[PDB]
């Protein structure tokens, strides 16, 4: 059991494939070139070619970068998608199309005063009878959004053809008269700029009775990360969550027999980004000096975990885990109702008892009370 706790990755940060936006004149620009914009839609089209989740290294389910998944249901093997819209067009006159190149006598105009258009409706993403055989999954990283956008004069784009232009054409064809991404009106114009306006997005994870392990994505854009929250519905299984040093709001709906494990190794350690991935360093001094425990809320450094459901259960313990050495694991046994914790050190008996002094120093460096400690030898 604590063995399963101790049994609980070079995955990239969010945006390595979809792009990480930039703040330009006080608004977020995801992409600012026609070909870059088209490439974003090409990336999105992967959800159709590969499904909403990819399987990396035959061990972990990874959603498409920037795909808005609003619900994951492990009971019904299903997904719900959130909002991924783009502003519609109105007006224009004399529309024709020649060689799949739209032409206008007078060009249409983009408006935020009429209903926006669903990009995902034009993809037709499979959301049912999914394979949730892998018990490790990276959580989705994408809040709902409406893409504001702009056209500009862009010549030489008439021969561009790929899965991105196909998807953009699919949007045009699905909402006739309301979307044109490349068109001639005395000059050649095209979409040049993608400007997401993100929306608060709660992602509901409906768990089954099984062992489910979750990796929280590393989202380096504050304005994206702050629109996201995860809400887990416990079903009495064994659940682990690897928290990111870039925190995301998380609520846990506790069921009677849930075993919850939170891997805090990123939260207690120096973090930097190298080659699009997390680089872990040494432990942070006093990072756990003010753990805040309440029946409905746990505060661990920059992490805030809210709790609902069976929150008045006096008998439940949850566990925080991290690595002190390459051979010794620290488990923080937390009772939310008692507002209390104790410590468990786990490792090989010979090694652990040898390095006991060193290990208790690390605990004290982390800011933890070292007064209640149990020892589990392997």
């Amino acid at each position, epitope marked *: 059991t604590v063995a399963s706790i101790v049994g609980i990755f070079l995955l990239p940060i969010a945006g390595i494939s979809a792009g990480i936006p930039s703040l330009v004149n006080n608004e977020l620009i995801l992409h600012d070139k026609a070909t870059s914009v088209v490439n974003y839609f090409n990336h999105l089209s992967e959800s159709k070619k590969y499904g909403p989740l990819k399987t990396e290294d035959d061990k972990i389910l990874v959603p498409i970068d920037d795909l808005v998944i609003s619900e994951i249901d492990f009971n019904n093997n299903s997904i719900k998608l959130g909002t991924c819209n783009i502003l519609a067009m109105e007006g224009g006159s004399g529309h024709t199309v020649t060689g799949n190149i739209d032409h206008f006598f007078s060009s249409p105009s983009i408006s935020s005063h009429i209903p926006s258009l669903s990009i995902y409706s034009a993809i037709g993403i499979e959301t049912e009878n999914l394979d949730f055989s892998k018990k490790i999954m990276m959580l989705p990283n994408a809040p709902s959004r409406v893409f504001w956008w702009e056209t500009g004069a862009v010549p030489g784009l008439r021969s561009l053809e790929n899965d991105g232009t196909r998807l953009l054409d699919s949007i045009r064809d699905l909402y006739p008269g309301k979307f044109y991404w490349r068109f001639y009106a005395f000059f050649d114009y095209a979409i040049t700029t993608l400007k997401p306006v993100y929306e608060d997005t709660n992602i509901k994870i409906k768990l089954d009775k099984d062992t489910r392990n979750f990796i929280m994505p590393t989202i*380096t854009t504050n304005e994206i990360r702050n629109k996201l929250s995860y809400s887990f519905d416990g079903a009495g299984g064994t659940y682990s969550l690897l928290l990111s*040093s870039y925190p995301i709001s998380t609520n846990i709906n506790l069921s009677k027999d849930d075993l919850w494990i939170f891997n805090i190794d990123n939260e207690v350690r120096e973090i930097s980004i190298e080659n699009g991935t997390i680089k872990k360093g040494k432990l942070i001094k006093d990072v756990l000096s003010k753990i805040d425990i309440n029946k409905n809320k746990l505060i661990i450094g920059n992490q805030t975990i809210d709790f609902s459901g069976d929150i008045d259960n006096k008998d439940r313990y949850i566990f925080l885990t991290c690595e002190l050495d390459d051979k010794i694991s620290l488990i923080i046994e937390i009772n939310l109702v008692a507002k209390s914790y104790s410590l468990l050190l786990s490792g090989d008996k010979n090694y652990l008892i040898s390095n006991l002094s060193n290990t208790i120093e690390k605990i004290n460096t982390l800011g933890l009370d070292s007064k209640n400690i149990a020892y589990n030898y392997t």
Partner: nanobody
Amino acid sequence: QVQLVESGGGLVQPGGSLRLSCAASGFTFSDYVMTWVRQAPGKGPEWIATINTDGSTMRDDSTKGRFTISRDNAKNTLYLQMTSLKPEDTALYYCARGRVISASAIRGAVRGPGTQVTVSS
């Protein structure tokens, strides 16, 4: 006993650059990671960046390039280089000890009074 005091703010014209600094005393500076935060009225505190004891950094990528955190351990000083300032950057900028990113962690941080940065037209 811990002291943190920021300097370097002021009225700046749009497009200008500014280097903030924070002097520290009362603890072993090099043993801590250090954070820059900014706070404008009507918003929560905004985490800018944290610098590790090895000089590596963790940062918000919307501040990417324009804001750069650095440290000089011998001078017990944290720096924030700011580039191409804009009116939306107007806030009180302050230093916090440790890695403080969430609102509660920032509001409970060991921090300096801040240095005001005002960019306007």
